[PDB]
Amino acid sequence: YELTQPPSVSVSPGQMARITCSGEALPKKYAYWYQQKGGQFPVLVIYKDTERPSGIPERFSGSSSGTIVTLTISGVQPEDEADYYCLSADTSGTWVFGGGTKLTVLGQPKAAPSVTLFPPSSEELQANKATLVCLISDFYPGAVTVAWKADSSPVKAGVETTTPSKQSNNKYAASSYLSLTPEQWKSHRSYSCQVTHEGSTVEKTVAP
Amino acid sequence: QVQLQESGPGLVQPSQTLTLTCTVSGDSISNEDYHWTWIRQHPGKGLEWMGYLQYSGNTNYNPSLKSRMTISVDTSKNQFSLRLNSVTAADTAVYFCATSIVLTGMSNKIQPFDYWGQGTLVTVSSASTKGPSVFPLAPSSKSTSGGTAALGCLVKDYFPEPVTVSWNSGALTSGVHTFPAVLQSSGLYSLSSVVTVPSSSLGTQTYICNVNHKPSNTKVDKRVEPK
Amino acid sequence: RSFIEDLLFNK
Numbered sequence A: 001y002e003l004t005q006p007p008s009v010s011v012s013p014g015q016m017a018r019i020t021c022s023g024e025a026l027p028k029k030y031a032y033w034y035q036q037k038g039g040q041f042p043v044l045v046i047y048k049d050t051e052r053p054s055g056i057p058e059r060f061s062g063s064s065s066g067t068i069v070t071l072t073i074s075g076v077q078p079e080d081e082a083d084y085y086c087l088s089a090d091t092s093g094t095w096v097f098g099g100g101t102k103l104t105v106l107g108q109p110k111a112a113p114s115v116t117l118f119p120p121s122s123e124e125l126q127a128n129k130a131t132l133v134c135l136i137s138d139f140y141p142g143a144v145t146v147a148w149k150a151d152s153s154p155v156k157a158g159v160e161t162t163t164p165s166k167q168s169n170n171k172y173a174a175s176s177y178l179s180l181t182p183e184q185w186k187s188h189r190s191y192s193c194q195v196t197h198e199g200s201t202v203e204k205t206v207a208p
Numbered sequence B: 001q002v003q004l005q006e007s008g009p010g011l012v013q014p015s016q017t018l019t020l021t022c023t024v025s026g027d028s029i030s031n032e033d034y035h036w037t038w039i040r041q042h043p044g045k046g047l048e049w050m051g052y053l054q055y056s057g058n059t060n061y062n063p064s065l066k067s068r069m070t071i072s073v074d075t076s077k078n079q080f081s082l083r084l085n086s087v088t089a090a091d092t093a094v095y096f097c098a099t100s101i102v103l104t105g106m107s108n109k110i111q112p113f114d115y116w117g118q119g120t121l122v123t124v125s126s127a128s129t130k131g132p133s134v135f136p137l138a139p140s141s142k143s144t145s146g147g148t149a150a151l152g153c154l155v156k157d158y159f160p161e162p163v164t165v166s167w168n169s170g171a172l173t174s175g176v177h178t179f180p181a182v183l184q185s186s187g188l189y190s191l192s193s194v195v196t197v198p199s200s201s202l203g204t205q206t207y208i209c210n211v212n213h214k215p216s217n218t219k220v221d222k223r224v225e226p227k
Numbered sequence C: 001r002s003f004i005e006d007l008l009f010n011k
Helices: A122-126 A182-187 C004-008
Strands: A008-011 A017-022 A032-036 A043-046 A060-065 A068-073 A082-089 A095-097 A101-105 A114-118 A130-139 A145-150 A153-155 A159-161 A172-180 A191-197 A200-206 B003-006 B010-012 B018-025 B034-041 B047-053 B059-061 B069-074 B079-084 B093-101 B120-124 B133-137 B148-158 B164-167 B189-198 B208-213 B218-223
Touching: A008 A017, A017 A082, A017 A101, A043 A060, A068 A082, A095 B047, A114 A191, A114 A200, A114 B148, A122 A130, A122 B133, A130 A145, A130 A182, A130 A191, A130 B148, A130 B189, A145 A172, A172 A182, A172 A191, A172 B189, B003 B093, B018 B034, B018 B093, B018 B120, B034 B069, B047 B069, B059 B069, B079 B093, B133 B208, B133 B218, B148 B208, B164 B189
Parallel strands: A008 A101, B010 B120
Antiparallel strands: A017 A068, A032 A043, A032 A082, A060 A068, A082 A095, A082 A101, A114 A130, A130 A172, A145 A153, A145 A191, A159 A172, A191 A200, B003 B018, B018 B079, B034 B047, B034 B093, B047 B059, B069 B079, B093 B120, B133 B148, B148 B189, B164 B208, B208 B218
16 A cells, blocks of 8 residues: 655745645544654644644644545745655555655755865874865755866866755754875865855865 | 753664664653654755654554654653664754654644654765864954954764754853854864953863764863963 | 554545
8 A cells, every 4th residue: 555645846935835645544543644854753734634633833724525635725925845755554464654745945045055174184184194184064955066276277076075964953064074195285375165156166275 | 851862963874774763751651542653854855754653553654754754662761763774875864753642632733743753864975974073263362352352163074964062061042152163174064162251261270161062972071271 | 342443544
């Protein structure tokens, strides 16, 4: 038994969001809607097809049309950006989660990245290693381009960069690491990390 | 109201038996009202209900897992447990313990899951654990912006996930910046943690990042002093 | 008598 949901619903703020869940046993089995944020345990937002739990905003509602149940969010807010799962059961008593739907609230206020570049620490150099740490936080949207330079020349060898992800403040963060030998760090005049976000670039530079 | 805490995250080798416990506080594991439940979620995928057990022995297991899993109870420790046999990479997931309560004589039940833990990450891998090397990201005039300065800790080359970082044993919460870990070409993770603090506090206030890597049973308290 | 699946799911 499978409960089928749309994989994603992309909606700008203020628009109405509708997330369905279909299963052949829904005419006889109640559905429950769950909200998951940040990989945490999900929170019930609608129970028994139509009912709203206490403490849940009134903008959440739910309806039933037999084999299909629909979670509806009027006045979609940036906080409503989450993954949503219907829960029901088959006729044998097995509890079954739907496949989940990612609600993306596109069009939130833009935010430029805060960039801090850290040089290798003395402890790491004394351990015969060297890492430059470029940290990027509080930016939106989540698309970003990170480049490194040795002096004024581009470098890609030894670079590892995270895929950006949203933090607790509903903003995106990312990190880029450049591994060097201590003598490569001490031999150059400077190293830079360039962070491009929505066409504009921020560059931080450090020197030994 | 009970509080549920899963056992620590870590590695299990393919074809071996995954074992997890959930310690229950606030009421007895032997009470039949409680349906002791396990739920899992592979990273980047959906939620999967595994099943529940009641102390009487009544069980209800996910049919695709019923010949691989056992839920059991340890009365002495007030715990219930998950056993999953012959695991593969498909069984890598965050495992959440939870419970559902039926009171004798209730006719209206609202919450399928009344109380829950916050999950524990089990990584199915034949690779070996590695504890982190922790380096200070010292505050200097080059990491200070106006009234506030940034300092941090570099948590280098560990496996598997997860790592948690606090500052000054949790007393410092304002200004703590969280960052996703990078997965390096060598198979090892690194992450950074940064706190922004008043620049004037640097001479007098001690700053220590508390790094916890439970899969290697390692904790590091790193003093971060200004440069 | 109602069991947990009756209480939660059976309409």
